A paper describes a structure:
NoVs recognize specific glycan ligands as host attachment factors or receptors for infection. NoVs interact with HBGAs or other glycans through their capsid protrusions that are built by the dimeric protruding (P) domain of NoV capsid protein (VP1). Genogroup II (GII) noroviruses consist of human noroviruses (huNoVs) that generally bind histo-blood group antigens (HBGAs) as host factors and three porcine norovirus (porNoV) genotypes (GII.11/18/19) that form a genetic lineage lacking HBGA-binding ability. In this study, we solved the P protein crystal structures of a GII.11 porNoV (VA34) that was isolated from pig caecum contents in 1997 in Japan and a close-related GII.3 huNoV (TV24) that was isolated in 1977 in the USA, representing one of the earliest huNoV isolates, focusing on their HBSs compared with the previously known ones.
To this end, five oligosaccharides, including A type 1 trisaccharide, A tetrasaccharide (referred as A-tetra, Santa Cruz Biotechnology sc-285031), B trisaccharide (Sigma-B1422), H disaccharide (Sigma-F7012), and H type 2 trisaccharide (Sigma-F7297, see Materials and methods for their sequences) were co-crystallized with the TV24 P protein. However, only the electron density map of the A-tetra, the only tested tetrasaccharide, was found clearly on the TV24 P protein that was solved to 2.5 Å resolution (Figure 3(D and E)). The crystal structure of the TV24 P dimer-A-tetra complex was solved by Molecular Replacement (MR) and showed a clear electron density map (mFo-DFc) of the extra density of A-tetra at 2σ contour level. All four saccharide rings are modelled clearly, indicating the HBS at the conventional location like those of other GII NoVs, on the outmost surface of the viral capsid (Figure 3(D and E)). Besides, R452 forms Van der Waals interaction with the methyl group at position 6 of the Fuc ring. While this Fuc-binding site appears to be highly conserved among most GII NoVs, we noted that, unlike R452 in TV24 HBS, most other GII huNoV HBSs show an aromatic residue (Y, H or F) at this position forming Van der Waals interaction with the Fuc via their aromatic ring. A strong H bond with K363 (about 2.54 Å), and four water-bridged ones with A359, H360, E361, and S449 were found, making K363 particularly important for the A-tetra binding, but this appears not the case in other GII huNoV HBSs. Particularly, Glc forms two direct H bonds to R452 and another one with a water molecule, stabilizing the TV24-A-tetra complex.
Author numbering:
A (entry chain D): 223 to 294, 308 to 538
B (entry chain C), D (entry chain A): 224 to 293, 308 to 538
C (entry chain B): 222 to 294, 308 to 538
């Protein structure tokens, strides 16, 4: 009678990052006591409630849509009046931190800005979005893009396709530092809650990708709490969470053996019994399998 | 015994299965003068992938491999791997590496590299799927770039963005490229589809891709959204008949706006004549009614 | 080789416009103001031609706006307005002004008409109200909320607002000397033009007063501006150097030739007179203000 | 002798002199098929007001007076006062009360009242300048309203907002109304104007007025911005010749963009052929050069 909780059957190479439109590259764990893990994309509860700036379309994370105008080697600056991701007009009064899909990290997003005018003429060129700029105010409804080309028409529909990071100094990319969605004017609000292991000996487990970089030595490391397919899956199923913690096992269908076990928390993140920064090597055909709802005081087997 | 289901998705919550973009609209058109045989976004209702179709929405018209050398004046040779990094085998029974573009034209995007020493580069790139150097079935294709800042023998990725044709007629979404060039003809193709009932036309999930120049409409039609590709692969529910009856319902008013056939090979038809968009309200969604037979007469739209 | 002389335009009272609303001036008025803080932001100009607050030159754009209309998330329909600059430029909150130029500088409900013209040339216009006390009145952040009786508005279409008068239900909701919160409750008012007051014994502010139309109720529509809009425009054009902090002006009758009274025009752009009590200042139809001389601020005005 | 000057104003700092709205653009057109004889915004270079032109920017197409009774289907009679509240004298040598509309159509606005007991009303109203009851020269006109909430015999003001025509052809900005209705013809008109040099057309200060319905472009052209009306009235500089030479200058580049004639009767001409906007940078302004004669040959635009 109770709708059962499930996970989609996917290997590591069949999963997508929920903070950027790229495939998942690996599984990774590291200590996070020094940091506040409060990303806003890829935030979903196990019973299907989206949080933060999270939405369903994989391609739309860190993308935007709106109208370009002239503002007040990447020298050309442009003002973007943002619409909603689905084309509907944007209202700053909605109780989200920023338009859905807005980047949730400090740095420069490298991508391509494109335009299609009513007379059917089109143009597209490389563009960057400085999420640390004082004119990055997507919650207010606008942001600034930088371009190398001057081939852009004002008052024309503009789209931005995210590709990767485009910071000059590698330290400009801080994946766990939220931008100021209202610039200097207001604080961030309506945020999805921060996450941390509530248990001795446990660390967060990440679905990790290495984003493309347009220059420099940036590793492009972007960790999401849960892949986008699970966001989409939990939203569809909305199965009741019987406890705060679902027990999950990573299994190898060839050998039939459990490689490790982990906690999948109701708030939408994973923990594992392991210490220290390290990748988690999995077989190509392995997948995560839901074992049972469990009490939060369950002790995971170490790695 | 596993029932067939559709995910509950709005028009604005669907992704094109032939390009990593959202669906913009629903469209119908007569198709007797075109061959509808795209190879991405090809799935049967019981969850079998066909053509070059794979699961990752970002990897459609993307590639992965190694770059070597020889106004987008700079030409580069790309030795293709599989999207999962494993080496591509031209002997497998697919038309080309999974996610290879299935239309003639120039795919506009960004090529990027990350070297073992951690140095990186990314610049605009075009993939001409009509060039004789476009032989992804043989394991290689060619890109053109405007920037010369690329390192040979380095891991290279391609992020698709849109179309980049100079002449608008270069983009032909219903003409498959030659996956092996002029060395041989295409093989292992997902079958072509057509309406097979009087007064019926295909129903398309339409996107308008970005265009880097010119007047190209960038129109790209797919047979089912990528989310249905992913959902049918997961569910693998047995197809009880050749045709599923599906209805589009407005949850605000409770009313059915139109009905359609969802065919086992993974495409939809409606009772409609003429090239036309299908205007649907923002909260509408497709509902699976039941399995029927091909002789069902749909209500005209 | 002399400096540019300071001048006033020659205008009677029935030839002047309010600088806080697009209406003519009805009368001159004086009133004690030690109770209140006089800090309006429209119609603020220095005598040497510097605009302050939200003051701009176009008389019709005071309390007007333009932007893109959006549906919100009896005047019972609510709409969101993404505000542009009055010239179609996107509004920059980083500019050192309290709010977009022309933004209303008082608490209450501005009554007017909102209109739209679509790219397909279709048009609409209907009555609308701007509640400057609503928590969604955040023009400094680039948006505000209008309310309408009609539902005939298209979202995501270019929209203008023409101000007409006040539209409060209860008369006490209109407080001309209370500034709105230009960012709502989210941050403080910034870059305000300074407050004004007579810093001389026996002196009170002199106002150019209009009675705005009202859409209902018993509101007197009284709106006092420090300086008429024609002087805002004139001082900006002339930018004559201010020799002292006080210019002595006299209201003269060209028929009789006699001086009716004298007043101080202060450099910050306001006027004082030697008078006490709330009272209108009756003037002849042909009378006008005449610049007499720069004076030291301790000059003593003749009473009345 | 007082020299002639223009105020230093940007295009976005000028007001229409025929309606209380900002100037939207500059515009030129051949005008041999129209009569350019507006009555608001009429001033000579030496400061003489003409037609129905007055100083208050908010009072153009406004009125003041006393209302009585006679889908905007409520009709009301307005006994007109002067804009300064003084009674209107039809005997004066003006075409109509100052500020009276100078085009055929329906002026859309808001009529408001304030009673001696301080009760107030305001609702949408229209002034049809083509109606037989539009006789402002005789001292009265007629409004229509949607609301019935109006008290007879009370002081009534009209605030113009834009046009309110149902058919778009009813708005004829170059057709003067009959200020006395059918009783007699218009009198005391400001003179009509026309270019008088080969290749020269009038240059208009153009606004696009709000429209309460339909597809009317709301285009309203004035010969001179209201600020120039106010400036020349203040200055009253002697017009040394019939024509002033004026140039449009960009301060961001120092370059002159075009030159024009400013004629003594208060209108401008340029060397241009066709109906066209005049694109100007945001910081440009008109600069008075000197007095010339009507035989000057402007450089083509
Ligand atoms: C993020 C971005 O838009 N980058 C641009 C930009 O990258 C070059 C500049 O960032 C430049 C600043 O000094 O540094 C270049 O690299 C140095 C490197 O830091 C040194 O350690 C040494 O190797 O000399 C290099 C000379 O370039 C940046 O070049 C980029 O990064 C390098 C690590 C390498 O991968 C190179 O191929 C990259 O181009 O400007 C370049 C154009 O010159 C690109 O437009 C890039 O996107
Ligand atoms: C696909 C691609 O890489 N396009 C480039 C390239 O586009 C320009 C060329 O296609 C060029 C050939 O002469 O024509 C330009 O547009 C003309 C158009 O053909 C005329 O009909 C008329 O409209 O003048 C236009 C001036 O550009 C192409 O420009 C691009 O397309 C236009 C329709 C317009 O949208 C413009 O903004 C575009 O840039 O070269 C340009 C660089 O100049 C771009 O690099 C573009 O990506
Ligand atoms: C500002 C606004 O939107 N006004 C509307 C609104 O006005 C009427 C309501 O505000 C109503 C609320 O009770 O009160 C009315 O006047 C009452 C008055 O309060 C009573 O003391 C008594 O005198 O009865 C009156 C009604 O006959 C408001 O009416 C308006 O104000 C009156 C003094 C008078 O001037 C009348 O003509 C006005 O309409 O709602 C009305 C709807 O009829 C209008 O839409 C008005 O603009
Ligand atoms: C000038 C005025 O008072 N206008 C009113 C009035 O306008 C509507 C009527 O004029 C009506 C006559 O049938 O036509 C409407 O628009 C049609 C349009 O003619 C058709 O071509 C098609 O587009 O369908 C439209 C449906 O409205 C007029 O509506 C107004 O003009 C339209 C172009 C559109 O912009 C609409 O939003 C406007 O309201 O009546 C309406 C109320 O019904 C208003 O009161 C308007 O001010």
């Amino acid at each position: 009678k109770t709708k059962p909780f499930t996970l989609p059957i996917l290997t590591i190479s069949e999963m997508s990052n929920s903070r950027f439109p790229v495939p998942i590259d690996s599984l990774h764990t590291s200590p996070t006591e020094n940091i506040v893990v409060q990303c806003q994309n890829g935030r979903v509860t196990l019973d299907g409630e989206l949080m933060g700036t999270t939405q369903l379309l994989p391609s739309q994370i860190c993308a935007f849509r709106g109208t370009l105008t002239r503002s007040t080697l990447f020298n050309y600056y442009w003002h973007i009046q943002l619409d909603n991701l689905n084309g509907t007009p944007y209202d700053p009064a909605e109780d989200i931190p920023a338009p859905l899909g807005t980047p949730d990290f400090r740095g420069k997003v490298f991508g391509v800005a494109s335009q299609r005018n009513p007379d059917s003429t089109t143009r597209a060129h490389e563009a960057k979005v400085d999420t640390t700029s004082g004119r990055f105010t997507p919650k207010l409804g606008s942001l600034e893009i930088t371009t190398e080309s001057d081939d852009f028409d004002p008052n024309q529909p503009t789209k931005f396709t995210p590709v990767g990071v485009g910071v000059d100094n590698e330290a400009e990319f801080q994946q766990w530092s939220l931008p100021n969605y209202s610039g200097q004017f207001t604080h961030n609000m309506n945020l999805a809650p921060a996450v941390a292991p509530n248990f001795p000996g446990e660390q967060l487990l990440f679905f990790r990708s290495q984003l493309p970089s347009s220059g420099g030595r940036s590793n492009g490391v972007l960790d999401c709490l849960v892949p986008q397919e699970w966001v989409q899956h939990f939203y569809q199923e909305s199965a009741p969470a019987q406890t705060q913690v679902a027990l999950v096992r990573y299994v190898n269908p060839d050998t039939g053996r459990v490689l490790f076990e982990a906690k999948l928390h109701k708030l939408g993140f994973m923990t594992i019994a392991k210490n220290g920064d390290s990748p988690i090597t999995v077989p190509p055909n392995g997948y995560f399998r839901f074992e049972s709802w469990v009490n939060p005081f369950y002790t995971l087997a170490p790695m």
